[PDB]
């Protein structure tokens, strides 16, 4: 859920060389002391707690091993990634669809789509330096990034098909009857109809 | 149209001249730099006479 | 076998260290024989100063020296000799050596430098002449530059009426700027000479710039308004009668 | 802690807190030193002749205060420290010359698209979308410099996102204007209402 | 094989203050059913171990190595080596580099379906080349500049750059052919027979 | 470490060591004379003037003194008038034009009886600018030259904005290179910085004027009507100072 | 157009086949079943070598 992720981070503390039968450790409080805690610009500590644990391995019946684990639940403050990562991706995603309102005769459809893709590729630098380079799972930033990339590429492919269709003439192709029926007869009936048949 | 075609043919001829000139200049410069790099070898002796 | 701090040691240090560290990484132990012979083999991680000859980078070879000498004792107190038992070379155990993936060792001699001309001191210098293995730069820099150069050539076969000469030439220039950004992370920063890779990159940039300029000239000739512009007679003679025969351009009819 | 809101035109309040690591306020206490005249030096001292200002930061103020606390009955032994507050101002010239001015000019370039012809060779969309690409390059540049906290958004980032949104809107507008300009009677029918609005009413209202 | 690579790291332990003459190194011995066995692997607590975010441990052997050629009083005679064979988990590189790079490279084949009258063929091809250059810039920061091999992603990027350059050259040739006129070129009957009748029939063109 | 030593400190230490930390051996003569030649890495704070960068000269200094001893109990004297550069390794970025050490003695009003001594060694250095000339200045010069070519490119090519905007894009991408290479300070504007800003404004002005030229070229005869001032200035008067055929 | 169609049917299979080859070398790259080539032992806690 990065950048809206929640992280549970522990700190396991114990006497390295003394077992419970010679040195016993107990917590001073149920919670860590956060009275002198400096505010963080990236994380909010929702919950914090300390738990004592005792373990006895079968080979060692009489020497319990003690530890105190202090766990912290932390929520990332997502504003930086929203402003610097998500909003540009959203703008590119919006710009992707605008090619389909551009006339073919403008000679700028490929310019627009390819420039959107070039912007997204340059943005890959920002994302990879800011995103975590781990393979435990795909972040939401990564999923949205790949989504935008894939659909810009899809827009480019379909735009090439549209331009190819637009430039067809009787000296190169003959119009199939099903194309006439589907696109020139049925579909425009359920559309704006401001366009003349 | 005839005058326009004369100007266009002049442009084509100049383009072909520049094509050949660029091929020659590119090949010569690239070959010079690449041969300068290739024939830079480590010294045969640790302590060459200078 | 005795802890090194328990015996007298010669204060042999790397004089030409670059980080301020003169000494060995771990003192370990000396081996003392019954005749008083002491052998000491301490490990050391050393960062030494090597003046880089940048002229032929990345097809370069370097001459990185490690100068070892006593920091305090003079030649009248401690005399140095190249260690041997007479191989005056850096020893490299063939099986256990960690070969570097970017450098091949060509030569590895050692020499005793006598004092120039007490306070005078000998030195033992271990030289490493190393050749770079440039495959990374061939794949990542040189080959793309060659491809961009080929595209710059092929701009002159693109017809003027396509309206695409400028786009091709100038995007080739933009791609070369991206490769300049690539090289900025890697090249040396000294100013005694220019690396040959930088020379090749600037050569390619100048070529693409001239391709842009000459494409503009060709487009200016192609789109020249017939009424506002009158062909001068020398232009007719040279470019329509003389040059086409030499360039094997047969104007139809 | 860097207050990012007005970066690079920002000022910061960096504290230097000094205290005994061992002794409490009953064991060791602090007072400020006095100058030759006996005036208490309740500030950071700076030798003017030997001082060289930081290349990016000017020290505007530097008061000092001796604080005493935790003297309550429950708290037990009192504690004390000395806090100096360096109020420092950034000198923003680098960001003005290298980032803000070029970004402002390049983002102003999209307004020129409204003056290019709405034909096949006008390159209206060339100007707009490539300005967006240049702004993406500037986003990559600015990401290397800005602080990486989320308490607020820095001025530099806010301006860049604002001009990116404006460029996106102008791209949409250029697409719309091209779509309207290139309509042919063999595809579209002459909408009389919009024609009345744009050709007859708007010039009169203008 | 990067990013589908596996590595073979090692941790070699020995004594520099003592030799095989003075200490003998051996592997730890554990017991089961009153039968002793050597511990010939790196121990990993199954419950406490958190796996690395990019590396999976496949094998983790341990070995005592004795060099028969070295003298017994050399420090290099004996050692114990703990090896880690680790496989990279390539999900990150896949999602963020390889799928976009492959898709962008494969888009260059679309120029063959664009008409020459669109006026945007070479721009598409050269822009794909630019995007590949950006990807090469990205990869160059992530691997060492060794010469033992070209990385797999490097091989693909070089192959794609060469193919895109070839496609740009082909687009130039196609445009040159398209824009020929009687005033500039002669269309021979052989070329017409080959390209307008024979090849379109073979290729099942419309 | 066994003997009394003077506690020399680099007064203008920036973020390194204030005093000697490498305690090498002292040579002691039978007459009591001690020589002690420790090494150090000095990180000295120095006012850096970037006005003429990449062709800048930097007069830097190293102030040395006994931190806790004043001149009345410990006196320091220079061995020589100049720093010893006999074992100086050549630099690939700087050339030491001048170097000199000066002793100074200062008496404060509150302390009329304890003069405070120091020895300040200064080095006047010139930067070697070839690296910045080749890597930074030459690409900017090429972009500036390409800027003017748009005014020789005909409008009917439909490529004017392609050339101009792509030059702008190349310069913007190059700005990443410049920010990586040049230092980032706000004490003053470097010469590279001034040239970089000049080139950028040059390109932006070219784009604006190119848009004006394109708009003039495409002015429809129906909607627009030629002002008499344009006709007199451009069709009637100016071409006489040039050589092209009138309308 | 005919040249464009021939180039579509020649270049695209070359691209697909080359990409498939280059990536299939890596997809089927795996560490060997045993840690040491020539040694059949697995060095796993399951396969203890009792003395
Ligand atoms: C740069 O950075 C420095 C350091 O952060 C800034 O200085 C600090 O500014 C704070 C205000 O923003 C100051 O806090 C206020 O102090 C007022 C002083 O009045 C005294 O209050 C005493 C009360 O007990 C104090 O000490 C105990 C110690 O245990 C502590 O728990 C209390 O919270 C309190 O600090 C009293 O004993 C004494 O006689 C004075 O009357 C105080 O009145 C303020 O309280 C108001 O605001 C708080 C807001 O939370 C509110 O709860 C209260 O009811 C009340 O309305 C503040 O506590 C702080 O003391 C400054 N520190 C110094 C000077 O050392 C500096 O301003 C910054 N500079 C800028 C931004 O330019
Ligand atoms: C780079 O920057 C460094 C500084 O960091 C520059 O170094 C300066 O070089 C000049 C010479 O070019 C130095 O001036 C000389 O100083 C000596 C020694 O002065 C000391 O000793 C004196 C007693 O012998 C003493 O009187 C001096 O004290 C004076 O100043 C203090 C205040 O600072 C004042 O309170 C006193 O009352 C005095 O007025 C000081 O302790 C001095 O002997 C030289 O005199 C000869 O030359 C001068 C030339 O003007 C001439 O006037 C004299 O008559 C005499 O012939 C001279 O003054 C200066 O001190 C150095 N500053 C340092 C090191 O801090 C360096 O030049 C810069 N390089 C470049 C090229 O820019
Ligand atoms: C982030 O990660 C940490 C671990 O790092 C998690 O911490 C765990 O917290 C739980 C409690 O929430 C710990 O479980 C135990 O809590 C018991 C408290 O008693 C309550 O619960 C029982 C059972 O429902 C009720 O009967 C009772 O009335 C209370 O409501 C303790 O009694 C447990 O102690 C037992 O085990 C220890 C260990 O051997 C023995 O020493 C004790 O004698 C006793 O037998 C226990 O402490 C759990 O152990 C914690 N784990 C660790 C490792 O600290 C956080 O919850 C997690 N945060 C998230 C994800 O929100
Ligand atoms: C890598 O770098 C090392 C140094 O870091 C280079 O080593 C230097 O190599 C040069 C050339 O081989 C050496 O120069 C030669 O030194 C000889 C010995 O000089 C010593 O003995 C004389 C006589 O007592 C003393 O006067 C002198 O101070 C030295 O103590 C000289 O005999 C040579 O002179 C001959 O050649 C010169 C050529 O110019 C003639 O002018 C002379 O008349 C004479 O015929 C010569 O000067 C130099 O000493 C080496 N430095 C060392 C060892 O520290 C490596 O060459 C370099 N490797 C590579 C391949 O780049
Ligand atoms: C990850 O990396 C480690 C190294 O860091 C690899 O470990 C090496 O594995 C190889 C193959 O198992 C080892 O090579 C073999 O060594 C055997 C023992 O050699 C010692 O003993 C002989 C006498 O018996 C001495 O002569 C020799 O000097 C040594 O002291 C040999 O018996 C093996 O011979 C076999 O291979 C050769 C190949 O030429 C054949 O000719 C033989 O007939 C025979 O089949 C072999 O040489 C090597 O020693 C290991 N290095 C170590 C332990 O440091 C891992 O295999 C690697 N993991 C991977 C890649 O998955
Ligand atoms: C932020 C920093 C960077 C700024 C970047 C540069 C500044 C960018 C911002 C704005 C200024 C850009 C001006 C470019 C003019 C081009 C020439 C032109 O078309 O003239 C026009 C006059 O235009 C006017 O009517 C006057 C406009 C002045 C606006 C000044 C705002 C500042 C001609 O008008 P027309 O013939 O009726 O045009 C018909 C065709 N059309 C509908 C397509 C227009
Ligand atoms: C037809 C379409 C166009 C074709 C496209 C082919 C694209 C490359 C395909 C992959 C080649 C891999 C290769 O074996 O490269 C070799 C040539 O290495 C070179 O030197 C080649 C690069 C030369 C760059 C230009 C030099 C100009 C002078 C070097 O290989 P290696 O580094 O010894 O080992 C590589 C890794 N391996 C061991 C797994 C093989
Ligand atoms: C048709 C033909 C068109 C040709 C177009 C050619 C264009 C050529 C353009 C050349 C520009 C050269 C700039 C040099 C700056 C020098 C430093 C400076 O004064 O900066 C100051 C801040 O300056 C700012 O804040 C910048 C403001 C914007 C400047 C550019 C506006 C472009 C408008 C476009 C619409 C800092 O003040 P300072 O610290 O007092 O400066 C000391 C300077 N000294 C050391 C030299 C004394
Ligand atoms: C864009 C193109 C036309 C420019 C470069 C063309 C020519 C000059 C290039 C292309 C490939 C080059 C060769 C590639 C590799 C080698 C092997 C090396 O051991 C010596 C140089 C040599 C033999 C090169 C010489 C120059 C060369 C022939
Ligand atoms: C290739 C051409 C057309 C454009 C680029 C020009 C380049 C190659 C020029 C510009 C400045 C030049 C350098 C200027 C001075 C020196 C110092 C000396 O050691 C001679 C060579 C050397 C190092 C030159 C090498 C070539 C150089 C780097
Ligand atoms: C899209 C256009 C209109 C605006 C572009 C600038 C964006 C980044 C600006 C516009 C309004 C801004 C927000 C306004 C107010 C606040 C509350 C403050 O406590 C934290 C920052 C926060 C949440 C700002 C973050 C940045 C912000 C979202
Ligand atoms: C056109 C589509 C397929 C996108 C391009 C996919 C390219 C980049 C290929 C090259 C190598 C491929 C990977 C190789 C191995 C595997 C097998 C399995 O672990 C799941 C898929 C996965 C991880 C593949 C995903 C797709 C992949 C990354
Ligand atoms: C041809 C283009 C898209 C290049 C990328 C090809 C990728 C997507 C393809 C080529 C062959 C594919 C592999 C073929 C077979 C298997 C085995 C099965 O368990 C699924 C995953 C896996 C391992 C595939 C992963 C994806 C793969 C690597
Ligand atoms: O010129 C005299 C002046 O010279 C210098 C010093 O070292 C000072 O002590 C003395 O006052």
G19: Cβ below 6 Å to ligand 13? yes
Considering every ligand atom, which ligand is closest to the CA of F118? 2
- The DSSP annotation for F190-232 comes to -HHHHHHHHHHHHHHHHHHHHHHHHHHHT--TTT----HHHII
Greatest pairwise CA separation for chain G in angstroms: 78
Q: In the structure encoding, which two tokens stand for residue E192, read together?
A: 């017409």
Q: Cβ(D162)–Cβ(D110) under 8 Å?
A: no
Q: Which atom of ligand 2 is nearest to the CA of F105?
A: 41
Q: Cβ(C90)–Cβ(C65) under 8 Å?
A: no
The C-alpha atoms of residue C182 and residue B13 are separated, in whole angstroms, by 38
F169–D133 CB contact, under 8 Å: yes
Q: Which residues contact E40 (CB under 8 A, 6 or more apart)?
A: E27, E61, E62, E63, G41, G43, G49
Ligand 2 geometric centre to CA of D54 (Å): 25
The C-alpha atoms of residue E20 and residue E13 are separated, in whole angstroms, by 13
Decide: residue F178, CB within 10 A, 0-12 exposed, 13-18 middle, 19+ buried: buried
Mutate to test the pocket of ligand 5, among G38, G39, G40, G42 (most ligand atoms within 8 A of CB): G38
Of all residues in chain F, what percent are helix, strand and coil, respectively (each to 5)?
35, 20, 45
- Chain A residue closest to D158 (CA)? A83
The C-alpha atoms of residue D128 and residue C184 are separated, in whole angstroms, by 30
* N- to C-terminal Cα separation, chain A: 49
Decide: residue F30, CB within 10 A, 0-12 exposed, 13-18 middle, 19+ buried: exposed
Of E83, E156, E174, nearest to G22 by CB-CB distance is E156
Ligand 7 geometric centre to CA of C207 (Å): 26
Nearest CA to ligand 9 atom 1: C150
Q: Does E181 touch chain B (CB under 8 A)?
A: no
Considering every ligand atom, which ligand is closest to the CA of D105? 6
The C-alpha atoms of residue G7 and residue E170 are separated, in whole angstroms, by 8
Decide: residue A48, CB within 10 A, 0-12 exposed, 13-18 middle, 19+ buried: middle
Q: Does G21 touch chain E (CB under 8 A)?
A: no
The C-alpha atoms of residue C224 and residue C231 are separated, in whole angstroms, by 10
Ligand 12 geometric centre to CA of G29 (Å): 13
Ligand 7 geometric centre to CA of F12 (Å): 55
Q: In the structure encoding, which two tokens stand for residue D106, read together?
A: 């390049």
- The DSSP annotation for D81-150 comes to EEEEEEEEEE-THHHIIIIIHHHHHHHHGGGGGGGS-SSTTS-HHHHHHHHHHHHHHHHHHHHTTS----
- CA–CA distance from F143 to each of B29, D126, F177 (Å)? 22, 19, 14
Q: Is the dihedral of CA F179, F185, F189, F191 positive or negative?
A: negative
Of A107, A142, A145, nearest to E119 by CB-CB distance is A107
Q: In the structure encoding, which two tokens stand for residue D181, read together?
A: 């300009």
The C-alpha atoms of residue A131 and residue A117 are separated, in whole angstroms, by 19
Mutate to test the pocket of ligand 8, among D101, D103, D105 (most ligand atoms within 8 A of CB): D101
Q: Where are the beta strands (DSSP E) in E17-67?
A: 29-32, 35-38, 55-59, 62-66
Chains that touch C (3 or more CB pairs under 8 A): B, E, F
Considering every ligand atom, which ligand is closest to the CA of D13? 1
Q: How many residues does chain C have?
A: 253
SS3 C220: helix
Q: Cβ(D134)–Cβ(D167) under 8 Å?
A: no
- The DSSP annotation for E152-173 comes to HHHHHHHHHHHHHHHHHHHHHH
Taking CB atoms within 8 Å and a gap of at least 24, the contacts of B4-9 are B4/C226, B5/E183, B6/C226, B6/C231, B6/C236, B6/C240, B7/C221, B7/C222, B7/C224, B7/C226, B7/C229, B7/C231, B8/C160, B8/C222, B8/E183, B8/E184, B9/C239, B9/C240, B9/C251, B9/E183, B9/E184
Q: Which atom of ligand 13 is nearest to the CA of G20?
A: 1
- CA–CA distance from F242 to each of C222, F217, G7 (Å)? 21, 19, 50
Given phi > 0 = left and psi -120 to 50 = alpha, else beta, which region is C28? left
Ligand 6 geometric centre to CA of D115 (Å): 5
Considering every ligand atom, which ligand is closest to the CA of D162? 11
Mutate to test the interface with D, among F46, F208, F211 (most CBs of D within 10 A): F211
The C-alpha atoms of residue C197 and residue C182 are separated, in whole angstroms, by 12
Q: Does C251 touch chain E (CB under 8 A)?
A: yes
The C-alpha atoms of residue G35 and residue E8 are separated, in whole angstroms, by 9
What is the experimental method? cryo-EM
Q: Which residues contact F46 (CB under 8 A, 6 or more apart)?
A: D52, F12, F58, F60, F61
Q: Rounded to a whole number, what is the distance in Å from the CA of A36 to chain E's nearest CA?
A: 31
- CA–CA distance from E156 to each of C135, E39, E58, E88, E139 (Å)? 16, 43, 27, 19, 12
Q: What is the DSSP letter of F88?
A: P
CA angle F105, F109, F110 (to 5 degrees): 110
The resolution in angstroms reads: 2.0
Q: Which residues contact C106 (CB under 8 A, 6 or more apart)?
A: B42, B43, C61, C129, C130, C131
Cis peptide before A64 (omega within 30 of 0): no
Backbone φ and ψ of A58, nearest 5°: -65, -40
Ligand 2 geometric centre to CA of F103 (Å): 9
Backbone φ and ψ of A188, nearest 5°: -65, -20
Q: Cβ(D56)–Cβ(D89) under 8 Å?
A: no
Q: What is the DSSP letter of E76?
A: T
Q: In the structure encoding, which two tokens stand for residue D60, read together?
A: 């505007």
Q: How many residues does chain F have?
A: 247
For the CA atoms of C32, C36, C37, C43, the dihedral, rounded to the nearest 10 degrees, stands at 40
- Which of E98, E64, E62, E93 is closest to E78 using CA atoms? E64
Backbone φ and ψ of C113, nearest 5°: -95, 115
Q: In the structure encoding, which two tokens stand for residue E16, read together?
A: 């520099």
- CA–CA distance from B5 to each of B10, B17, C99, E182, F245 (Å)? 9, 18, 67, 11, 19
Q: In the structure encoding, which two tokens stand for residue C120, read together?
A: 């005078």
Q: Where are the beta strands (DSSP E) in C120-191?
A: 123-132
CA angle E147, A126, E95 (to 5 degrees): 65
The C-alpha atoms of residue G34 and residue G31 are separated, in whole angstroms, by 8
The C-alpha atoms of residue C140 and residue C181 are separated, in whole angstroms, by 12
The C-alpha atoms of residue E157 and residue C76 are separated, in whole angstroms, by 63
Q: Is the dihedral of CA E53, E58, E60, E65 positive or negative?
A: negative
Q: How many residues does chain D have?
A: 206
Taking CB atoms within 8 Å and a gap of at least 24, the contacts of F109-115 are F109/D36, F110/D36, F111/F70, F113/F72, F114/F70, F114/F71, F114/F72, F115/F70, F115/F71, F115/F72
Q: Rounded to a whole number, what is the distance in Å from the CA of E28 to chain A's nearest CA?
A: 17
- Tell me the CB-side half-sphere exposure of residue E61, using CA atoms within 13 A: 17
Q: Do E and C touch (≥3 CB pairs < 8 Å)?
A: yes
Of all residues in chain D, what percent are helix, strand and coil, respectively (each to 5)?
40, 15, 40
Backbone φ and ψ of A68, nearest 5°: -120, 120
Of A118, A127, A153, nearest to E130 by CB-CB distance is A118
Q: In the structure encoding, which two tokens stand for residue A191, read together?
A: 């559309």
- CA–CA distance from B22 to each of B15, B27, B29, C179, C210 (Å)? 10, 8, 10, 22, 9
F195: Cβ below 6 Å to ligand 8? no
Q: Cβ(C161)–Cβ(B5) under 8 Å?
A: no
Greatest pairwise CA separation for chain D in angstroms: 96
Q: Cβ(F74)–Cβ(F109) under 8 Å?
A: no
Q: How many CB atoms lie under 10 A from the CB of residue A61?
A: 8
Q: Rounded to a whole number, what is the distance in Å from the CA of E21 to chain C's nearest CA?
A: 11
Q: In the structure encoding, which two tokens stand for residue D22, read together?
A: 């061992």
Q: Which residues contact F231 (CB under 8 A, 6 or more apart)?
A: none
The C-alpha atoms of residue A156 and residue F130 are separated, in whole angstroms, by 45
- CA–CA distance from B33 to each of B37, C8, C177 (Å)? 6, 57, 20
Q: Which atom of ligand 8 is nearest to the CA of F188?
A: 39
The C-alpha atoms of residue F103 and residue A125 are separated, in whole angstroms, by 54
- CA–CA distance from B11 to each of C223, C250, E176, F43 (Å)? 9, 14, 14, 63
The C-alpha atoms of residue C151 and residue A52 are separated, in whole angstroms, by 70
Q: Which atom of ligand 2 is nearest to the CA of F102?
A: 64
Q: Cβ(D113)–Cβ(A112) under 8 Å?
A: no
The C-alpha atoms of residue D72 and residue D54 are separated, in whole angstroms, by 43
């Amino acid at each position: 859920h990065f950048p809206f992720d929640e992280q549970n981070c522990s700190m396991k503390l114990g006497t390295w060389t003394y077992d419970g039968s010679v040195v016993a450790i107990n917590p001073e409080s149920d919670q860590p002391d956060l009275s002198n805690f400096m505010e963080s610009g990236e994380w909010v500590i929702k919950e914090s707690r300390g738990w004592k644990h005792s373990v006895t391995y079968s080979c060692c019946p009489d020497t319990p091993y003690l530890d105190i684990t202090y766990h912290f639940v932390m929520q990332r403050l997502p504003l930086y990634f929203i402003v610097n990562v998500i909003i540009p991706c959203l703008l590119f995603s919006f710009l992707t669809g605008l090619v389909f309102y551009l006339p073919t005769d403008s000679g700028e459809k490929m310019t627009l789509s390819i420039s959107v893709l070039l912007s997204l590729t340059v943005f890959l630098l920002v994302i990879v330096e800011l995103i975590p380079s781990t393979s435990s799972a795909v972040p939401l930033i990564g999923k949205y990034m790949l989504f935008t990339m894939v659909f810009v590429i899809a827009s480019i492919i379909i735009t090439v098909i549209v331009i190819n269709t637009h430039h067809r003439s009787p000296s190169t192709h003959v119009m199939p009857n099903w194309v006439r029926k589907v696109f020139i007869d049925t579909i425009p009936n359920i559309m704006f109809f401001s366009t003349m048949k | 149209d005839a005058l326009k075609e004369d100007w266009q043919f002049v442009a084509m001829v100049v383009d072909r001249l520049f094509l050949w000139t660029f091929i020659i200049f590119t090949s010569v410069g690239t070959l010079v730099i690449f041969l300068d790099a290739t024939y830079h070898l480590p010294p045969p002796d640790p302590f060459p006479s200078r | 076998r005795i802890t090194a701090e328990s015996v007298w040691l010669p204060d042999v240090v790397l004089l030409n260290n670059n980080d301020g560290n003169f000494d060995v990484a771990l003192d370990i132990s000396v081996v003392v024989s019954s005749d008083g012979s002491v052998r000491w083999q301490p490990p050391g991680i050393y960062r030494s100063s090597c003046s880089i000859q940048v002229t032929y980078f990345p097809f370069d070879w370097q001459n990185c020296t490690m100068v070892f000498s006593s920091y305090s004792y003079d030649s009248s107190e401690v005399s140095l000799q190249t260690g041997l038992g007479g191989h005056q070379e850096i020893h490299i155990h063939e099986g256990t050596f960690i070969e570097n993936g970017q450098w091949e060792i060509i030569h590895k001699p050692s020499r005793l430098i006598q004092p120039p001309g007490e306070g005078q001191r000998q030195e033992v210098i271990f030289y490493l002449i190393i050749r770079r293995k440039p495959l990374f730069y061939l794949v990542n820099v040189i080959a793309p530059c060659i491809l961009i150069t080929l595209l710059a050539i092929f701009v002159f076969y693109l017809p003027p009426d396509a309206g695409e000469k400028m786009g091709l030439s100038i995007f080739a220039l933009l791609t070369l700027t991206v490769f300049l950004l690539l090289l900025a992370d890697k090249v040396p920063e000294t100013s005694l000479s220019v690396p040959i890779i930088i020379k090749y990159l600037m050569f390619t940039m100048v070529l693409v710039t001239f391709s842009v300029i000459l494409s503009v000239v060709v487009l200016n000739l192609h789109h020249r308004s017939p009424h506002t512009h009158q062909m001068p007679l020398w232009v007719r003679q040279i470019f329509i009668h003389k040059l086409p025969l030499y360039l094997r351009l047969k104007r139809p009819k | 802690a860097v207050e990012v809101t007005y970066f690079p035109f920002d000022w910061q309040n960096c504290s230097l807190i000094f205290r005994s690591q061992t002794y409490n306020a009953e064991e060791v206490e602090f007072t400020f030193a006095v100058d030759n005249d006996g005036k208490t030096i309740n500030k950071i001292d700076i030798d003017t002749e030997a001082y060289t200002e930081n290349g990016e930061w000017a020290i505007d103020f530097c008061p000092g205060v001796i604080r005493r606390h935790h003297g309550g009955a429950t708290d037990g032994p009192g504690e004390t420290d000395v806090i100096y507050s360096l109020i420092i101002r950034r000198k923003p010239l680098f960001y003005v010359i290298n980032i803000i001015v070029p970004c402002v000019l390049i983002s102003g370039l999209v307004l020129l698209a409204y003056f290019l012809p709405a034909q096949a060779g006008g390159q209206k969309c060339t100007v707009s979308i490539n300005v967006l690409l240049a702004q993406t390059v500037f986003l990559f540049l600015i990401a290397q410099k800005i602080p990486e906290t989320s308490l607020s958004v820095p001025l530099l980032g806010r301006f860049l996102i604002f001009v990116m949104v404006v460029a996106t809107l102008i791209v949409m507008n250029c697409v719309i204007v091209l779509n309207v300009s290139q309509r042919t009677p063999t595809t579209h029918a002459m909408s009389p209402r919009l024609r009345h609005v744009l050709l007859e009413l708007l010039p009169r209202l203008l | 094989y990067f990013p589908f690579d596996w590595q073979n790291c090692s941790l070699k332990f020995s004594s520099l203050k003592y030799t095989a003459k003075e200490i003998t190194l051996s592997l730890k011995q554990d017991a089961k059913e009153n039968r002793t066995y050597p511990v010939e692997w790196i121990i990993i607590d199954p419950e406490g171990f958190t796996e690395n975010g990019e590396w999976e441990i496949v094998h983790r052997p341990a070995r005592v190595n004795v060099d028969p050629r070295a003298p017994l009083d050399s420090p290099s005679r004996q050692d114990i080596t703990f090896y880690l064979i680790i496989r990279r988990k390539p999900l990150f590189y896949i999602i963020n580099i390889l799928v976009p790079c492959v898709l962008i490279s494969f888009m260059v084949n679309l120029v063959f379906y664009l008409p020459a009258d669109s006026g945007e063929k070479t721009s598409v091809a050269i822009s794909v080349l630019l995007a590949q250059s950006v990807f090469l810039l990205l990869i160059s920061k992530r691997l060492p500049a060794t010469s033992m091999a070209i990385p797999l992603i490097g091989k693909f990027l070089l192959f794609g750059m060469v193919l895109v350059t070839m496609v740009v050259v082909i687009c130039v040739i196609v445009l040159n052919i398209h824009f020929r006129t009687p005033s500039t070129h002669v269309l021979s009957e052989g070329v017409k027979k080959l390209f307008l009748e024979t090849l379109p029939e073979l290729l099942h063109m419309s | 470490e066994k003997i009394w030593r003077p506690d020399l400190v680099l007064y203008n230490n920036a973020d390194g060591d204030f005093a000697i930390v490498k305690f090498t051996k002292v040579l002691l003569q039978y007459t009591g004379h001690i020589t002690w030649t420790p090494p150090a890495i000095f990180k000295s704070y120095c006012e850096i003037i970037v006005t003429h960068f990449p062709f800048d000269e930097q007069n830097c200094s190293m102030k040395l003194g006994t931190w806790t001893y004043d001149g009345s109990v410990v006196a320091i004297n220079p061995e020589s008038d100049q720093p010893d550069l006999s074992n100086f390794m050549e630099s690939g970025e700087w050339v030491i034009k001048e170097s000199r050490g000066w002793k100074h003695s200062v008496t404060y009003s509150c302390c009329p009886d304890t003069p405070y001594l120091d020895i300040t060694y200064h080095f006047v250095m010139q930067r070697l600018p070839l690296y910045f000339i080749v890597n930074v200045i030459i690409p900017c010069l090429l972009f500036s030259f390409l800027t003017g070519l748009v005014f020789y490119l005909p409008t009917d090519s439909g490529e004017k904005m392609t050339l101009s905007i792509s030059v702008l894009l190349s310069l913007t991408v190059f700005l990443l290179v410049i920010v990586e290479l040049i230092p980032s300070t706000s004490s003053a504007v470097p010469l590279i910085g001034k040239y970089m800003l000049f080139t950028m404004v040059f390109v932006i002005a070219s784009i604006i004027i190119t848009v004006i030229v394109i708009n003039t070229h495409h002015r429809s005869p129906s909607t627009h009507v030629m002002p008499n001032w344009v006709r007199k200035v451009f069709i009637d008067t100016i071409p006489n100072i040039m050589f092209f055929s009138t309308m | 157009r005919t040249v464009d169609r021939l180039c579509l049917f020649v270049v695209t299979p070359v691209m697909v086949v080359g990409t498939a080859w280059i990536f299939l070398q890596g997809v089927y790259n795996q560490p060997p079943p045993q840690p040491f080539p020539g040694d059949p032992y697995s060095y796993n806690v399951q396969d203890k070598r009792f003395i």
